[PDB]
Design an enzyme around this catalytic site. Structure first.
Site, mmCIF file in Angstrom:
data_model
loop_
_atom_site.group_PDB
_atom_site.id
_atom_site.type_symbol
_atom_site.label_atom_id
_atom_site.label_comp_id
_atom_site.label_asym_id
_atom_site.label_seq_id
_atom_site.Cartn_x
_atom_site.Cartn_y
_atom_site.Cartn_z
ATOM 1 N N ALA A 1 -53.601 -45.109 -36.335
ATOM 2 C CA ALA A 1 -53.661 -44.127 -37.265
ATOM 3 C C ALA A 1 -55.367 -43.600 -37.366
ATOM 4 C CB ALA A 1 -53.149 -44.422 -38.698
ATOM 5 N N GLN B 1 -56.277 -41.815 -33.970
ATOM 6 C CA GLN B 1 -55.605 -40.538 -33.812
ATOM 7 C C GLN B 1 -56.296 -39.477 -34.965
ATOM 8 O OE1 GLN B 1 -51.900 -41.361 -31.255
ATOM 9 N NE2 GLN B 1 -51.565 -40.991 -33.170
ATOM 10 N N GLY C 1 -54.650 -51.462 -38.613
ATOM 11 C CA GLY C 1 -55.197 -50.744 -39.820
ATOM 12 C C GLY C 1 -55.447 -51.500 -41.197
ATOM 13 N N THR D 1 -42.176 -45.585 -39.996
ATOM 14 C CA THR D 1 -42.892 -46.743 -41.054
ATOM 15 C C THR D 1 -42.051 -47.925 -40.526
ATOM 16 O OG1 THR D 1 -43.495 -45.077 -42.648
ATOM 17 C CG2 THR D 1 -43.066 -47.322 -43.552
ATOM 18 N N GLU E 1 -44.742 -52.684 -44.050
ATOM 19 C CA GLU E 1 -45.766 -51.970 -44.284
ATOM 20 C C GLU E 1 -46.087 -52.018 -45.938
ATOM 21 O OE1 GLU E 1 -45.642 -48.380 -41.082
ATOM 22 O OE2 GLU E 1 -46.107 -47.774 -43.033
ATOM 23 N N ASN F 1 -48.929 -40.088 -46.276
ATOM 24 C CA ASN F 1 -48.126 -39.208 -45.192
ATOM 25 C C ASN F 1 -47.135 -38.290 -45.637
ATOM 26 O OD1 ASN F 1 -49.517 -39.638 -42.772
ATOM 27 N ND2 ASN F 1 -48.452 -41.568 -42.367
ATOM 28 N N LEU G 1 -73.461 -38.700 -49.723
ATOM 29 C CA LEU G 1 -72.640 -39.835 -49.978
ATOM 30 C C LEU G 1 -72.893 -40.581 -51.454
ATOM 31 C CD1 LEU G 1 -72.234 -41.844 -46.872
ATOM 32 C CD2 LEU G 1 -70.492 -40.486 -47.930
ATOM 33 N N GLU H 1 -73.955 -38.995 -53.971
ATOM 34 C CA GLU H 1 -73.355 -38.090 -55.112
ATOM 35 C C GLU H 1 -71.942 -38.322 -55.122
ATOM 36 O OE1 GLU H 1 -77.102 -35.372 -54.448
ATOM 37 O OE2 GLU H 1 -75.484 -34.196 -54.619
HETATM 38 N N1 LIG Z 1 -51.315 -39.267 -40.595
HETATM 39 C C1 LIG Z 1 -51.303 -40.324 -39.457
HETATM 40 N N2 LIG Z 1 -50.492 -41.527 -39.781
HETATM 41 C C2 LIG Z 1 -50.240 -42.435 -38.940
HETATM 42 C C3 LIG Z 1 -50.579 -41.859 -37.739
HETATM 43 N N3 LIG Z 1 -50.159 -42.842 -36.714
HETATM 44 C C4 LIG Z 1 -49.790 -44.029 -37.485
HETATM 45 N N4 LIG Z 1 -49.788 -43.651 -38.739
HETATM 46 C C5 LIG Z 1 -49.227 -44.320 -39.798
HETATM 47 O O1 LIG Z 1 -49.611 -45.649 -39.578
HETATM 48 C C6 LIG Z 1 -48.863 -46.659 -40.002
HETATM 49 C C7 LIG Z 1 -48.579 -47.604 -38.839
HETATM 50 O O2 LIG Z 1 -49.847 -48.060 -38.578
HETATM 51 P P1 LIG Z 1 -50.622 -47.952 -37.342
HETATM 52 O O3 LIG Z 1 -51.874 -47.402 -37.556
HETATM 53 O O4 LIG Z 1 -49.798 -46.986 -36.254
HETATM 54 O O5 LIG Z 1 -50.767 -49.599 -36.797
HETATM 55 P P2 LIG Z 1 -52.082 -50.070 -36.149
HETATM 56 O O6 LIG Z 1 -53.178 -50.023 -37.111
HETATM 57 O O7 LIG Z 1 -52.464 -49.395 -34.773
HETATM 58 O O8 LIG Z 1 -51.806 -51.692 -36.231
HETATM 59 P P3 LIG Z 1 -50.801 -52.559 -35.172
HETATM 60 O O9 LIG Z 1 -50.258 -51.452 -34.032
HETATM 61 O O10 LIG Z 1 -49.944 -53.071 -35.924
HETATM 62 O O11 LIG Z 1 -51.635 -53.418 -34.148
HETATM 63 C C8 LIG Z 1 -47.531 -45.927 -40.245
HETATM 64 O O12 LIG Z 1 -47.550 -45.677 -41.931
HETATM 65 C C9 LIG Z 1 -47.764 -44.487 -39.672
HETATM 66 O O13 LIG Z 1 -46.912 -43.355 -40.173
HETATM 67 C C10 LIG Z 1 -51.490 -40.643 -37.177
HETATM 68 O O14 LIG Z 1 -51.691 -40.337 -36.140
HETATM 69 N N5 LIG Z 1 -51.432 -39.783 -38.329
HETATM 70 C C1 LIG Z 2 -36.190 -48.785 -33.481
HETATM 71 O O1 LIG Z 2 -35.666 -49.381 -32.201
HETATM 72 C C2 LIG Z 2 -36.430 -50.372 -31.372
HETATM 73 C C3 LIG Z 2 -37.531 -50.631 -31.847
HETATM 74 C C4 LIG Z 2 -38.365 -51.523 -31.187
HETATM 75 C C5 LIG Z 2 -39.868 -52.096 -31.873
HETATM 76 O O2 LIG Z 2 -40.575 -52.791 -30.830
HETATM 77 C C6 LIG Z 2 -40.233 -51.780 -32.984
HETATM 78 C C7 LIG Z 2 -41.844 -51.261 -33.102
HETATM 79 N N1 LIG Z 2 -42.208 -50.970 -34.591
HETATM 80 C C8 LIG Z 2 -41.200 -51.040 -35.612
HETATM 81 C C9 LIG Z 2 -39.933 -51.439 -35.674
HETATM 82 C C10 LIG Z 2 -38.812 -51.827 -36.570
HETATM 83 C C11 LIG Z 2 -37.594 -52.205 -36.295
HETATM 84 C C12 LIG Z 2 -36.795 -52.245 -37.361
HETATM 85 C C13 LIG Z 2 -37.036 -51.820 -38.484
HETATM 86 C C14 LIG Z 2 -36.000 -52.180 -39.630
HETATM 87 C C15 LIG Z 2 -38.222 -51.336 -38.713
HETATM 88 O O3 LIG Z 2 -38.877 -51.042 -40.191
HETATM 89 C C16 LIG Z 2 -39.166 -51.170 -37.852
HETATM 90 N N2 LIG Z 2 -39.385 -51.666 -34.200
HETATM 91 C C17 LIG Z 2 -37.761 -52.246 -30.068
HETATM 92 C C18 LIG Z 2 -36.773 -51.747 -29.632
HETATM 93 O O4 LIG Z 2 -36.192 -52.526 -28.489
HETATM 94 C C19 LIG Z 2 -36.623 -53.851 -28.076
HETATM 95 C C20 LIG Z 2 -35.932 -50.987 -30.334
HETATM 96 O O5 LIG Z 2 -34.662 -50.743 -29.729
HETATM 97 C C21 LIG Z 2 -33.486 -50.588 -30.520
#
Ligand SMILES: Nc1nc2c(ncn2[C@@H]2O[C@H](COP(=O)(O)OP(=O)(O)OP(=O)(O)O)[C@@H](O)[C@H]2O)c(=O)[nH]1
Ligand SMILES: COc1cc(C(=O)c2cncc(-c3ccc(C)c(O)c3)n2)cc(OC)c1OC
Ligand SMILES: Nc1nc2c(ncn2[C@@H]2O[C@H](COP(=O)(O)OP(=O)(O)OP(=O)(O)O)[C@@H](O)[C@H]2O)c(=O)[nH]1
Ligand SMILES: Nc1nc2c(ncn2[C@@H]2O[C@H](COP(=O)(O)OP(=O)(O)OP(=O)(O)O)[C@@H](O)[C@H]2O)c(=O)[nH]1
Ligand SMILES: COc1cc(C(=O)c2cncc(-c3ccc(C)c(O)c3)n2)cc(OC)c1OC
Ligand SMILES: Nc1nc2c(ncn2[C@@H]2O[C@H](COP(=O)(O)OP(=O)(O)O)[C@@H](O)[C@H]2O)c(=O)[nH]1
Ligand SMILES: [Mg+2]
Lengths: 427, 125, 425, 427, 431
Positions: D12, D15, D138, D171, D175, D198, D244, D246
């Protein structure tokens, strides 16, 4: 020879000095360059090897603006630079600043210049000291100077011409303080002090000269005429008040009660011509509207009374004028003093500044009297002093210059004693 | 009246006019040093006042230093407490994570001993 | 008692300071290149009070321009009269004061303050006779307020016998820049009580009210407020700048205006009031003692005048001016203390301010000024009782006691004004 | 002089940095190679000897995928390679791995790079840290970073932009845990944190921009406008600037109470067929335009900072803000006598061509500290409580060395934080 | 996180593992010789997750093939794609385990496992960033279940920080007549509770019922069953093998799907259900896919999801379809069926879409649920175990290889404990 040295301290004393020396020069025929075509005028003017006649005068003002007038003025060539003493910073309307802070700085320089003048005299009578009651320099430096003149000139007369403050005229709020402080300190050191009430002079110019708002010049021109009348028998070979000692002899029976009232007539407008009689101008001497200090002589008793006539004045006419007022008017002298007048006629005609607002007159008169009524002027000052000092308003400005608070009350007690002395003799 | 001649000169004459004689017969200082003492005494009061004013402004200067100094001590104490806290939790986390991995590999090793007991009991039959 | 050294600090200090130099240069006939082009010698008689005379027949303001932020002095430089200032008299830091008195007074101000004193010290040595200092600043911000009062303190230590005079701008929620103005102003009022000789209270609350109610300006801007400030600063300096038989200087003004040392806060006034772009002597006399004309948000009929100094500009009967000033004093006798005889002094100067033909300017020492400090005190107390925003000050090294002592002193000032309001003869 | 260093952490944060630094380059005319045909942009760009302008920024992520797109995308020459820092394994949505297990392997590198950026500043203002609450990097790495920044840089200002999680936008289920854990750990170390919800950004892109299924690039481009409004005061020569210090002074009444509410207007579809200063100002107090879903009419304001950019005159701001002060639905706390700070930068808002936002002549960003933001905290804490009462997923945190005590200690801090918002809203 | 190391043990493990490799090789455009012949680059973006690049432009499955029975790897090499595997990754004994877990776990399997670790370490150390291991095996036999779990333990000892995933085939009397399969399954589940992170429960009972009831196959064969297994395995690895918005990998999956360490047994589901090698004459709609996916007839474990509650759900849709429509169907399924989702794990359903459908279908959906209904599978095994263990039937098969009754008692106890904690969380309230 009976030399007198004039000392002018602060703005009021310097600007009135200007008016006096200009008028003396016109009375004696001294041109502004010092040249000149009765030798009594030498009591007030020395003479240089170039033939120039030089006022026996020192001017002291701790602010260069006023003395710079003199340096570049019309009569600038009359004066030598060592007669003009300035500094950078005035007393800021503060007696303590003038007396202690700057007084200690310049007093020896000033006494050194006076001493150079005194060394030119073969028979110095004393000093004529011109100063305001209200200014920090005029009040504070003068009182230090008078103390030093008593030390350095023990047996010499000191006469003052003191400008008494008036709300009409430009006036700082602390002028009553400065007035009582300098009166206290100087009392023991003056032999005879002619007070000039700025309010009286302002009133004479408006009524007699038809000036809506008199300037310092209007006031100083009129004050010059009075000073001239008082000094005229010193500067010409007259018969009454022919040396400074004779002033206390004729007007000051008691040393503390040394504040004569001066009355002057006629003041006629140059714009405005019947010539007034000896009777009329003599009548005018017993009109309070023509006094130089505002007070009511009906509220007092006379100790002394001199009539100083100037110009075309014949003894026959004076005595008949005096006889007329004595039958119509009550003139109360104290019990221990005779009821009567000392009369002098000076034949030199009264002189006015050409183009000024005073018209040329044939004859004039100045009455100098020592009445107990003039203590009303002190009571006015004491009341304003009391109103402010009760709250200690502005006292921290005086204490900040190293004055002790207790000087305020010791000075005010002296004024209380003076009022009591006037009561006692006007019994 | 009674007129009395006083004087006659070149530029004037004088005399005295008496209207009534008096009812009543007859009539009813600092040194240089002293002055200098009082001028000097006032000067030393002026100077004492100025000295006390400058003394108070000096006291304010040092307070200013003490304020600037205290802020620097707070910042240093913030850093020191942040540093010790972080190192404490980093080492505790390390100890925990190593303790978990060692327990996990300890259980699998008991299993390894048990497998040797199974294989021995077999040959015993 | 000749030269004044002028210092403007922080954003507000520099905006109204620049407006002031702009106005008086027009009065003394000085163009932005520093050349004189006026028509009268009255304009040059006392011009050294405020200007140094450069080599090439040029006049350079005796002005020192200070900020912890470069932006504002940048703007001054490009302003109308920007080129008139000595370029090395700009002393500016880099990282601002964060609207924080503690930063301007202690941390960031200390690092810049000796650079400022060096420039003050050079301007002072080029004086035949130094009269004193005038400082323009606000009290509600960080730089003019905290660093301004630090400057005053250090200048007092180095020139303890010169008059210190400030134009101090009071904050108002009607025209706010920062939420911590009550703190900043209260901490500064403490300093001014102790360390100034004459402070002109310029109340943004009053300036806004004047523009809104009298000038009918629906939405006042700083331009509108600063138009009133420059007219006032021109008015209260007229006697320093033109020859008057009074021989006016800062110490004489303080002697006759300050009966008690702590009571040196003046209510400025001015008539007529004017909007940007767009009367008789009896009116001038009255309108000038009218609450609608005070640059401090205080009703003078709520207290009593200790002392008043008044200046009339333009051609007019000084007899009629003196007449009417007396008439006002008699009709309004109960709003003057009886124990200071003759406490109104009037001056006249023949030269009118630009665009006007007659003007009056009023300098009052009124016990009603306690209303200004009570308003600040109440706003301070509303914040400080919850300790809101306090940590941005303690984080700079300040103790809470500094806050309580400063307001204790300000309430003491209030009481002292009250004590003289009720004193009688 | 007055430099700010930006740090972008995790997916996040990285990007969003992409959208911000793209917009800044466009705002200042900087080409994607750092070249460039008002020098205030130097606070955010260093300059090399070849006239190349390099963001004062570090991009960090524990996995290389996202930052690899930077390394091979449009702006791959904008940053020095050493500013783009990646590990090989991410934190797998697990705070414990971002903060300890995985993050400890790269933290020294990141601080070394930041320290090299600080060495290029002559007057460092502070650090701006962009990160999500919900990601394992993050949350956990940002927490570690912020702690190390406090050790290295003391009380030097640290401000955050934080993505608050929303079920609508992708999400992970844990989280809520990562959000509370990073908030507890970061609270003492951040001076001011601008939260971005978001869901709120999502809903705006749907209502105002008519985008059925907004993408991150849709969301980030709107987020970048808001960010640019905040930093515009530091990057341009403005009329009214807000540095900053202020921001912190005027928005943060108590250290823990440092989470201002962002609002922005106008948000206009680029395909729609100019709004006044008043209109866009009133839009800042409408709940639809907020960056965090909450109800300010149900809370009390403690501070409002209004940041205008474009064609805006102060007389219009003054009139607009005066209208606001009369609305009864806009309640200020008892202890805030004055609650308004205003800035005006004159360069209009910039928009990425081919984006969805329309070019407008004037826009405004309001930062308000309202007690209503506590509603966002309560939503998170309830989700945390639901899972934590069964210790759901806690074993993944304990397995990485965390102790359950850290969870309850973090949740109690949020409870205390919620009670603080109650307390500061009383009378 | 990129490389996965695949292990297949025993007959079932090697049969379903071979099918898995045929199916994804076709999805990625890899022919039986290892050469890429596809059209889209997305076939190759994440191809390293399961394949090593052998020089010569070739792709070799990162796959280790294990059996105590030699004959089963002769049949792999003879199957289609037999030639694709690395010849040195075939590790074969010369005598099977006789459906005897103790032979696989303690004796013959233990004499071969170091041979297996040789290959496993070489494939692992070659990895840039090893994700972990996936093992295909059955639980009812001797090698897949006994040697497969032993292998898990040994690998976990050397790679304890990596994810351990299994595809575990549960026995059913409907498909096999071997009476001790309840024993082998129960001994294996004990091992899997302690030592894997994610286990896909593939139930022969469910597969048979789908073939008989829905596909109308009077006598289904392993071919018919393994068609359903391979459709599932392709679906549940889709996110690992193609680039998505999710940075999908095995540890992120486990973190979000497993709230309690022992409760890591997933119920897979799939839609549409098809017979092997059969033309599909009409595609399914997004609402059809969404509904049919949470329907008990589509579960690969013989459990009715409506008999429990979902702790977590991961769902993947494949094909060209509206992600908008997918999101609204998924959300609507959760709202109308609110009572089958635990309320104390908010937002516990995650959806992904991959634009590439599997071979022969225009659209499909695969379902990974962590449901408390999976206890029905373990109760079914536990009942069958007890009916034998009461009588100590066939115990001397196991004690003859060195085991003790106590090990049976403990494994039975551990599975009944598993049933209880599913039940504990099924009945748990948010208050
Ligand atoms: N506004 C906005 N939110 C984002 C973006 N990418 C991810 N998010 C939000 O960030 C949260 C997910 O965490 P990430 O920042 O993707 O995870 P990370 O910091 O890279 O940490 P790990 O992947 O777990 O190592 C979720 O709530 C997403 O919806 C983005 O590009 N813009
Ligand atoms: C969502 O489908 C998939 C996700 C992953 C992930 O790697 C992944 C990554 N980040 C988040 C999550 C996640 C999964 C479940 C819940 C309830 C949730 O809240 C978040 N999954 C891998 C898969 O196949 C190996 C897959 O195929 C069915
Ligand atoms: N008659 C008359 N009075 C004057 C004149 N100048 C000043 N005064 C009066 O003198 C008083 C003020 O004292 P100044 O003599 O001017 O001041 P200073 O003695 O020079 O002392 P500083 O305070 O140091 O300036 C006021 O009452 C004035 O009205 C003048 O030229 N003529
Ligand atoms: N779905 C499916 N199940 C199978 C297959 N082959 C065997 N099974 C099941 O696997 C269990 C028997 O395990 P096997 O794999 O044959 O045993 P093994 O691992 O080879 O062990 P041993 O043969 O004893 O050496 C029974 O439940 C069978 O129904 C297959 O190809 N597909
Ligand atoms: C009279 O107006 C002014 C006077 C001064 C003086 O310098 C000055 C000089 N001498 C005396 C006094 C004075 C002041 C007040 C009272 C009550 C009094 O009795 C006397 N003031 C300066 C001014 O502008 C700075 C000014 O502008 C309005
Ligand atoms: N009258 C007036 N007041 C101002 C001006 N600029 C700022 N202020 C006031 O000054 C206070 C803010 O302080 P400021 O000078 O801007 O901060 P500084 O730069 O840190 O000294 C607030 O009360 C503002 O209302 C101005 O041009 N005119
Ligand atoms: Mg990530």
């Amino acid at each position: 020879m009976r030399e007198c040295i004039s000392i002018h301290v602060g703005q009021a004393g310097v600007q009135i000095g200007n008016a006096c020396w200009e008028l003396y020069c016109l009375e004696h025929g001294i041109q502004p360059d010092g040249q000149m075509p009765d030798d009594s005028f030498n009591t007030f003017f020395s003479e240089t090897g170039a033939g120039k006649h030089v006022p026996r005068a020192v001017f002291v003002d701790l602010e260069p603006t006023v003395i710079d007038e003199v340096r570049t003025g019309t009569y600038r060539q009359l004066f030598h630079p060592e007669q003009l003493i300035t500094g950078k910073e005035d007393a800021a309307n503060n007696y303590a600043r003038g007396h202690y802070t700057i007084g200690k700085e310049i007093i020896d320089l000033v006494l050194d210049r006076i001493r150079k003048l005194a060394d030119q005299c073969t028979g110095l009578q004393g000093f004529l000291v011109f100063h305001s009651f209200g200014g920090g320099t005029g009040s504070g430096f003068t009182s230090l100077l008078m103390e030093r003149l008593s030390v350095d000139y023990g047996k010499k007369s000191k006469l003052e011409f003191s400008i008494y403050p008036a709300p009409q005229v430009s006036t700082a709020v602390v002028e009553p303080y400065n007035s009582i402080l300098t009166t206290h300190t100087t009392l023991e050191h003056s032999d005879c002090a002619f007070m000039v009430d700025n309010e009286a002079i302002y009133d004479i110019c408006r009524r007699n000269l038809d000036i809506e708002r008199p300037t310092y010049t209007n006031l100083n021109r009129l004050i010059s005429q009075i000073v001239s009348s008082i000094t005229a028998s010193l500067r010409f070979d007259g018969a009454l008040n022919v040396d400074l000692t004779e002033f206390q002899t004729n007007l000051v029976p008691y040393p503390r009660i040394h504040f004569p009232l001066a009355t002057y007539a006629p003041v006629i407008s140059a714009e405005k011509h019947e010539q007034l009689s000896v009777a009329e101008i003599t009548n005018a001497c017993f009109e309070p509207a023509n006094q130089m200090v505002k007070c009511d002589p009906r509220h007092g008793k006379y100790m002394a009374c001199c009539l100083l006539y100037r110009g075309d004045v014949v003894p026959k006419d004076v005595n008949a004028a005096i006889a007329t007022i004595k039958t119509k008017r009550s003139i109360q002298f104290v019990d221990w003093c005779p009821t009567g007048f000392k009369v002098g006629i000076n034949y030199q005609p009264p002189t006015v500044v050409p183009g000024g607002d005073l018209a040329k007159v044939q004859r004039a008169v100045c009455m100098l009297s020592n009445t107990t009524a003039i203590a009303e002027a002190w009571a006015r000052l004491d009341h304003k002093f009391d109103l402010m000092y009760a709250k200690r308003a502005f006292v921290h400005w005086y204490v900040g210059e190293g004055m002790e608070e207790g000087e305020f009350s010791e000075a005010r007690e002296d004024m209380a004693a003076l009022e009591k002395d006037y009561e006692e003799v006007g019994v | 009246m009674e007129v009395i001649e006083l004087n006659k000169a070149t530029s004037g004459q004088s005399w005295e006019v008496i209207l009534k004689p008096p009812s009543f017969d007859g009539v009813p200082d600092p040194s240089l040093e002293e002055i200098q003492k009082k001028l000097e005494a006032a000067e030393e009061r002026r100077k004492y006042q100025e000295a006390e004013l400058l003394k108070h402004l000096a006291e304010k200067r040092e307070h200013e230093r003490e304020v600037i100094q205290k802020a620097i001590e707070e910042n240093n104490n913030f850093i020191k407490m942040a540093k010790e806290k972080l190192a404490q939790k980093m080492e505790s986390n390390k100890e925990n994570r190593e303790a978990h991995l060692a327990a996990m590999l300890e259980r699998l090793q008991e299993k390894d001993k048990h497998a040797e007991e199974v294989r021995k009991n077999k040959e015993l039959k | 008692m000749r030269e004044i050294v002028h210092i403007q600090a922080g954003q507000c200090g520099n905006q109204i300071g620049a407006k002031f130099w702009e106005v008086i240069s027009d009065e003394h006939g000085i163009d932005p290149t520093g050349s004189y082009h006026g028509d009268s010698d009255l304009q040059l008689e006392r011009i050294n009070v405020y200007y140094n005379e450069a080599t090439g027949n040029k006049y350079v303001p005796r002005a020192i321009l200070v900020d912890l932020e470069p932006g504002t002095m940048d703007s001054v430089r490009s302003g109308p009269f920007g080129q008139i200032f000595r370029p090395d008299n700009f002393v500016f830091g880099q990282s601002g004061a964060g609207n924080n008195w503690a930063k301007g007074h202690y941390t960031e101000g200390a690092e810049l303050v000796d650079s400022v004193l060096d420039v003050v010290r050079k301007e002072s040595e080029s004086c035949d006779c130094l009269q004193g200092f005038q400082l323009t600043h606000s009290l509600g911000g960080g730089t003019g307020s905290g660093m301004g009062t630090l400057l005053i303190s250090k200048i007092r230590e180095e020139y303890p016998d010169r008059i210190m005079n400030t134009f101090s701008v009071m904050p108002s929620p009607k025209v706010s820049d920062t939420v911590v103005e009550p703190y900043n102003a209260t901490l500064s009022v403490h300093q001014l009580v102790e360390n100034t000789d004459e402070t002109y209270c310029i109340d943004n609350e009053a300036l806004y009210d004047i523009c809104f109610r009298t000038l009918k300006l629906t939405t006042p801007t700083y331009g509108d407020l600063n138009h009133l400030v420059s007219a006032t600063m021109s008015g209260v300096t007229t006697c320093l700048r033109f020859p008057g038989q009074l021989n006016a200087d800062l110490r004489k003004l303080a002697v006759n205006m300050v009966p008690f040392p702590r009571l040196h806060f003046f209510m400025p006034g001015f008539a007529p009031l004017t909007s940007r772009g767009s009367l008789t002597v009896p009116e001038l006399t009255q309108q000038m003692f009218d609450s609608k004309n005070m640059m401090a948000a205080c009703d003078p009929r709520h207290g009593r005048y200790l002392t008043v100094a008044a200046i009339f500009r333009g051609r007019m009967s000084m007899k009629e001016v003196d007449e009417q000033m007396l008439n006002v004093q008699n009709k309004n006798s109960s709003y003057f203390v009886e124990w200071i005889p003759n406490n109104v002094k009037t001056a006249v100067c023949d030269i009118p301010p630009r665009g006007l033909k007659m003007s009056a300017t009023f300098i009052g020492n009124s016990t009603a000024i306690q209303e200004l400090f009570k308003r600040i005190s109440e706003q301070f107390t509303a914040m400080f009782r919850r300790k809101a925003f306090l940590h941005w000050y303690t984080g700079e090294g300040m103790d809470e006691m500094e806050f309580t002592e400063a307001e204790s002193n300000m309430n003491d000032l209030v009481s002292e004004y009250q004590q003289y309001q009720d004193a009688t003869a």
